[PDB]
Each structure stands twice: as C-alpha cells, then as structure tokens.
Design a protein around this nucleic acid. Structure first.
Lengths: 168, 142, 183, 74
RNA sequence: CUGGGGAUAACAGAGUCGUCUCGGGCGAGAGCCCAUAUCGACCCCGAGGCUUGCUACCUCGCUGUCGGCUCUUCCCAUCCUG
RNA sequence: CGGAGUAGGGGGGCGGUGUAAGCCGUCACCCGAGAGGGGAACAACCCAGACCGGGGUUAAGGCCCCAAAGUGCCGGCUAAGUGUUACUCCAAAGGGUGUCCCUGGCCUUAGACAGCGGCCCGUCGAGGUCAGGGGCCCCGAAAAUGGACGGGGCUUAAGCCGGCCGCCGAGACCCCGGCGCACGGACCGAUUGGUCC
RNA sequence: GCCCGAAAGGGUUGACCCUCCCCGAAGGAAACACGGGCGACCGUGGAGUACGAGGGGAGGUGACCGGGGUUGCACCGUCCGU
C-alpha cells in the first residue's frame, strides 16, 4: 500500500457516513482492551499527540501486537491494563486509474483523526513496572507518522512524570 | 606613493582600503605580501583556492579563467575584485597598483605605513593561516 | 562562566630553573635544556616566589582544559630534567627468530616472518636505545621524543594481511614510564 | 556604593512559561533590568514583553549563590 | 484536396513523483548458545528524476525518426588496478 | 433617446476535487489597460498612481569595497565559511548534552574513583552525581562543460539574538513659477466664439 | 575636447565675466558656553542668525554668445508591427 505522508494530514473533510459511502471496507483491527481489566492499579502511562494526525489501522495493529507482546513477556497478564482509545472512522479513498476523467476515489482503508494533545493509548500499571510501560511508550512512538509524547498520571488527576522519572 | 607593509594584516580589510585609495587617485605599493593572514580553517580555505585554480573553459584553455597561484598575485587579484574592472576608471585605478613579495632593495630603509583597521590583535580566535602557506599548497614559487 | 580568575601553580624542585620569555617556556635541570611554546589568547605564564603560575581572567570550560593541559606539560618537562623517562619493549616470535640491531639513527629488524628485506625505524634526536636479550629500553629526557621513538619501533612490525590471532610475531610496549600495560 | 541584587521573574518561549532567579552587581536596578532583558533575550530567543520581572531586591554579599558574583564581592 | 490551429494529441524540453530505483529509524526474530559476522519481517522518515505514467506551460510545415559506424568530453552510485 | 466595445482572462487570498502538478468555482486588491523608486535581472512581492521647469523633506529599504550613506554603540551566542535568502527561488524521522543557559531530587567534613588489605580506618579534600527543559551549531546529507551569499571577501564579523543612535535614499509630501481642463460670472463680438475674474 | 562658421537669431544703443547694496518661499547650518548619557549621541543659548529658487540695483571689463559636425568620460537603456 501507499506511504502515510499521503494520509497523515487533516485538511480534507470528514468522510464517515456508511449509509452514503458505497463499497466501504471493514476494520482490520478488532481488539482494543488487554490484560487485567478490573485490578485498580496506581499509575497511568498515557500517550498524547503533539500535533493533529490521521493514524492508519495498519499502524494501530502493529502497535497493538508489539506492545502487548513486550508486556506479556515481561509483566504478565494479571497486570498491565492496556487500552487503545481511538476507533478508525475516516474512510480513505484512491483514484482508480482515462486519467483525471471522472476522478473520485474508491475506498481503500480507514484511519483515526487525532487532535492536538489527545490521548491515543494508555497502560495502567503498578509501581514496579514503570520502566516496561515506558518501553512500550517508546516502541509505540517509533511506529507513528508524526511525533508524540507520554505522561504519567496519578489517581485524583495529577501529573507526576517529573518525579517518578527522577526516582529510577 | 604610499608604501604599506602587509605583515600581520587581514587581507580583505587591507584590500578594501587599498581599492578606495586607488579610486581616489593615489599610487600604492604593498610589500611583504606573503605575511598577510586569512582567518578560519585550513581545509576549507585550501579547498576554496584549489577549486579556484581548477576552473577553465572546456572548449579552449587560452580563454581562462586564470586564477593565481602566487602570493603577490593572490593579493592583487583580491584588490581587483574590489574594483569596477569592467570600466576604464577601474582599469586605470588597477594600473596604479603594484604588489611585491618581501622587500626589494629599492624600498629598503623607508617609511612603511600601516592600516589600523586591519590588524590581527583585533582578533580573538586563533584559527588562521598565511597567504604564503596557501601559495605553497597550490604549488607557487613563493 | 565557571569562575573569575582560574590560577594554577607549580612549585619548582631543588635544582631547576624556569625562564619564561615570549610564549616560550625554558627549563634547566641537572641534565639538558628544554623548550616549549605554549600560547592561547588570554593565557599568561610568569614566575613567583618559586612558582610557575598559569592564569586566566574569566574562563570557559575549554579554557580550563587548556590551562590544565599546559600545566601537565610543564610538570613533565620538570620531572624530565630532574630524573628522566624510560620505556620498555619486549620481543616475541613463534618461528623465524628476528635480529634487532641499533646502528646510527635507525633500528634494524631482520628475519621478521622470514622476510629477506629489513624493516627500519627512526630514532629522534636525544634518545638512547639499548637491547638486552629479548628486551629493548628507550630512555631520555623528552617524554614526547621517547614515546615517539618507542612507537616507531613498535609500528616497524605491523601486519595487515593475515589473522593476528595466529600471527602475533612483533615488538610490543609493556611499560610506559612506570605504568604497566594490562588488558 | 556597589550593591548586590537578586531578581525573580518569569519568561515564556513557544507557549510555555519558566521561572528564574538571578544575582547581579550594580549601582541601581535600571541597569539590572536592562542586562536581564539582554541576557535572557540572547540565551533563549525571547522578546522583552514575554519577560515578566516580579522583584528586584537588594541583598548582601554573603547570602549569594553565584560563584562569579560571590568572588567579585569577596 | 483547401483554409486554419500549439485554443488540441504523437516528440524533445518544462512541472510532479503515485509507480520505480537507491537508502535510512526501531527491532520481531533467524544465526550450537549470541539482535546487530551475515540476514533482517510488520509499521514509520527520506534522496534522485537515468523507469513508466499524470498534466497540457513552449513548439503544427525549426528539426518529427529507432538502432548501428565514427569522434570528443563529464559524474560516481567502484567491476579490475593502489 | 442614441453610439459602442466585450462572450480565450491571469497573479494573490478562500473552498471542493486530486499522490501531486493541476482542474473547477468564489473575493474583486493588482497585471491586463499602470510610468517612477526597491527586491541582482523579475506582468501582477514591498513603497508609491504620471501636465512642464526649478528648489527642499521623507517612504520602501539600506550605510567594509564594487555603490550615495556607519569598518556605528551597548549586552550576549556561533567555530560549522554554518550563515551572509521577507516572498517570488531554502530536505525529515531519528540522534549528539558539542557549547551557552533555567529547573528539580540523592549525596557532600567526606562524597563519584585511585590506590595498600580483609564497607573503612591514614590517602587524597570540594564539590559530585541522576533526571527533566530551552538557545545556537553538529550528524543523518550522492551527478553529470568550469562556477556562484549578485561578486570580492568577512570569524569579540562585514554572521545571529535583545535593544538603541545618527546619516543616505523616489516623479510620493511641502514651496515658487508656467501650461491646460471643468464649473460659475462679467464684458466684447456676422454665426459652434473670445479677454478677464 | 577637436573643428566650422551665416547674421536669415542676438550682440559695442554693451557679449561674456568679477566684486558690493536691498527684498526673499519652503527649508535651515557650524564654530562656541554650559549641562544629560557606559556610549554612538542629545538638550539648552548661539539662531530662525549665516545661507537659500528667485525678484531688483551699483560699479569694474571690453567681444563673444546661441547654434552645428564628430567624439571622450560617468549614470541610464534587451529593436519595430502583430
């Protein structure tokens, strides 16, 4: 398939409505929560977008697999509540190539529209796996089209990344 | 004729002053052309001047360019660069100048001017090279 | 900046005399003179009660590093006119024993790996080479000259074409002015 | 008389704030203001409106914490 | 056949680079064991304009020709020679 | 009431489509149909809308030489000729603490090693170490005739940041004089008028 | 700068040039006396003076000027119609 520099920008209108789009495809990604889904952990390691993006589902799935494998091999299912927050709604289209006669693209895939400083994914963990959560952060960051940054969140809604990073 | 000792002078600033004198109407003689200095890194400087020397017309090498290899001629050519060479005024000005390596017998024990706004104590950083060094790298007999 | 008046001081020993005139430092001891140019903008050198002082008036990190480099050099000059320096070299061979000779300003090595042609190594002015069995000694007053002579002798025996695990014949350094070499 | 001064303020670069406290020798506080503006403008590319000075207070040459000034004061 | 047209295609030029060619980041792992001697998935970032396409700015009686022979010169993204 | 021309538009900003270049519309400042002063040259980027002859002051921008006017002043950064490019006409993800700075924790009358020995006594004695952030630069970075910051050249700059002080520079603005036009009026006329205000 | 002259153009009924007196638009100095500023500079008084397109006068001088042909220096300037 085509490079993501074509689809990372957010300047086109939203194109979501299934009852008017003909030939629209289904999602390749199907799982969005992982691990222990009730354990009431302490720390929330969340990724945020630096600027607005459109992320493809191919990338989303690559991230899913990579991160969950790291976390399962080095933490264990009974910990590490992993979640992907954003669903792919926008339909990507390509012009069936005649030339520019009758150019209006046929559907080829899906992406999720993310705005500036919008949470993409989260890993809830306990005190003694922060380093593995941050490894997941870095692995994910490396597979996105634009830049991102992570925060560490406590209960009560507070940002604690400074000091929690300092002590390690 | 004004006689200027180039020992320890920054080449471009010296050349600017000299070009203005020649345009105002004075005869000038520069001595110790090999002891003027050029500031910066040796590799970049030498690469510039070697690139200058390997420029030629592809269809006929008797039509130039003819950038210099000797020190006196390097200095002369810099001054020429600072003049209106395409006009008769500039040509006459350029004829009013002479440049010499070392000090010839004819100028021994004489008054040597100095240009204050060119002088290397003015400088702070020690990265510099000498025009004689450049000539030797290019292959000039001095 | 780091500070405001970085000032380093070296105390002169029993019979040494330091002259400082014009970016040139000169040292006299029991044995031989020694000269060295040490210049950088803003760095000054002069003499005190007995001391050699190096001083700068509003330094940056790089300037600090340079001041202390100059100090190291002066101390080596002084220790050298006071005592001197001596390096040690060892010779090893599997097959083909090599003969090492001192003749003039060159060291000559022959029968290295079976070669008919002898290799040669320069000896810089003011350095003495002795050969005792399987061992070579290089002694003098100038640290840089002594080290350079030793490095010349060691590079005169260099192999690029075959595996150095199996082919190890050569001449190697084992001690530089006291501190031994260890892996 | 050459006094000693402590400055406390805030400066903004590309959206985000950052506080600072500095120390200076001087004969006034006007000179202090001018030098603070110049220094922060050079070292963080910040114009004078996005520098906010809260306090320029005179202090003593022994409750200082900057080696250069501590020594120029002795 | 006549009258016209670069208001309009073929071709050289100009633009662009989906495609192409050449690279890179991370690291799934493969390699007795050992991530990186060698090979490197999936995702993500680029260079070039010598491959093909897209467009229609220039040229409709400029020359419209492919290949081969002859003759000169330039680049390195190096097959041999150091 | 009468006389036309115009039915191929473009630059710039906005929208839809398209990998993009482009295609299709929209606004109505400019070019077209617009001189002059600047940006090296440039249809539409900046200043500014033009009767003639003179005298002055400013605009855009600029003041080392080419080239009129600053080798101008104060504080700081850059060592890569980086840069010396408002736009027309400038390569990233990812890395380096290379250097200048703002922060926050753990140590510090003995700490991080450096040595003699099985954590420390005599050792050296003064500041050290982990994290986050910013400014400038460095790596990532390969092409064909001989060559481009416009050129020379420039390194406490003739580069960059934060500010300041004087000068040069248009047909613009001020002033003096002269020509024409439009409207109104007075007077003089063989009749589409004229002298004057 | 070199050269040529008719008198239809002017001019001894005064060409050109030199000095002095008066009025003068917009605009507008410097030296100098004090002070402010780390400084480049500025403020005050000198002074709206000295100057200043131009509008008048008085005396010294005694023969050219305007024009034309060609050409040098500096600044500017990529033909005409479609």
């Amino acid at each position: 398939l085509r490079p993501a520099k074509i689809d990372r920008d957010v300047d086109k209108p939203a194109y979501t409505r299934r009852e008017y789009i003909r030939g629209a495809p289904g999602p390749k990604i199907t799982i969005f929560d992982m691990g222990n889904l009730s354990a009431e952990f302490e720390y929330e390691v969340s990724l945020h977008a630096e600027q607005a993006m459109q992320i493809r589902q191919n990338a989303l799935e690559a991230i899913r697999i990579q991160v969950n494998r790291y976390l399962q091999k080095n933490v264990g299912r009974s910990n590490y509540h992993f979640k992907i927050r954003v669903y792919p709604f926008q339909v990507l289209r390509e012009n069936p190539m005649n030339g520019m006669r009758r150019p209006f693209g046929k559907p080829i895939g899906l992406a999720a529209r993310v705005r500036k400083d919008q949470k993409i994914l989260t890993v809830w963990v306990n005190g003694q796996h922060l380093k593995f959560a941050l490894g997941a952060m870095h692995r994910a960051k490396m597979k996105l089209p634009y830049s991102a940054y992570y925060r560490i969140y406590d209960k009560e809604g507070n940002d604690v990344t400074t000091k929690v990073l300092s002590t390690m | 004729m004004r006689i200027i000792n180039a020992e320890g002078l920054i080449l471009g600033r010296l050349a600017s002053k000299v070009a203005k004198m020649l345009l105002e109407g004075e005869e000038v003689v520069i001595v110790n052309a090999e002891k003027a200095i050029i500031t910066g890194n040796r590799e970049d400087i030498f690469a510039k001047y070697k690139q200058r020397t390997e420029l030629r017309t592809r269809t006929n090498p008797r039509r130039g360019p003819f950038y210099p290899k000797r020190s006196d001629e390097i200095v002369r050519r810099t001054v020429r660069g600072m003049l209106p060479w395409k006009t008769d005024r500039g040509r006459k000005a350029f004829k009013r100048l002479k440049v010499y390596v070392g000090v010839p017998k004819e100028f021994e024990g004489k008054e040597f001017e100095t240009i204050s706004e060119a002088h290397m104590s003015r400088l702070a950083t020690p990265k510099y090279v000498t025009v004689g060094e450049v000539a030797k790298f290019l292959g000039g007999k001095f | 900046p780091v500070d405001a008046w970085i000032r380093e001081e070296i105390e002169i020993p029993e019979g040494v005399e330091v002259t400082v005139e014009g970016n040139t430092v000169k040292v006299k001891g029991p044995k031989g003179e020694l000269q060295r140019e040490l210049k950088y903008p803003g760095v000054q050198i002069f003499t005190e009660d007995g001391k050699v002082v190096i001083y700068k008036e509003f330094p940056r990190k790089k300037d600090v590093a340079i001041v202390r480099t100059f100090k190291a050099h002066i101390n080596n000059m002084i220790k050298g006119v006071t005592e001197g320096f001596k390096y040690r070299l060892k010779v090893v061979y599997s097959h083909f024993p090599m003969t090492v000779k001192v003749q003039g300003d060159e060291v000559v090595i022959e029968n290295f790996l079976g070669e008919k042609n002898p290799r040669r190594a320069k000896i810089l002015p003011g350095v003495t080479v002795k050969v005792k069995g399987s061992e070579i000694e290089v002694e003098g007053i100038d640290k840089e000259a002594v080290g350079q002579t030793a490095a010349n002798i060691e590079q005169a025996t260099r192999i690029t074409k075959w595996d150095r695990r199996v082919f190890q014949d050569g001449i190697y350094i084992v001690e530089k002015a006291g501190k031994p070499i260890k892996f | 008389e050459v006094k000693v001064f402590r400055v406390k303020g805030t400066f903004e670069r590309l959206g985000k704030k950052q506080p600072f406290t500095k120390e200076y020798r001087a004969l006034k506080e006007e000179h202090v203001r001018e030098l603070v503006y110049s220094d922060i403008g050079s070292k963080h590319r910040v114009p004078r409106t996005k520098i906010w000075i809260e306090s320029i207070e005179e202090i003593k040459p022994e409750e200082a914490e900057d080696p250069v000034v501590r020594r120029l004061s002795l």
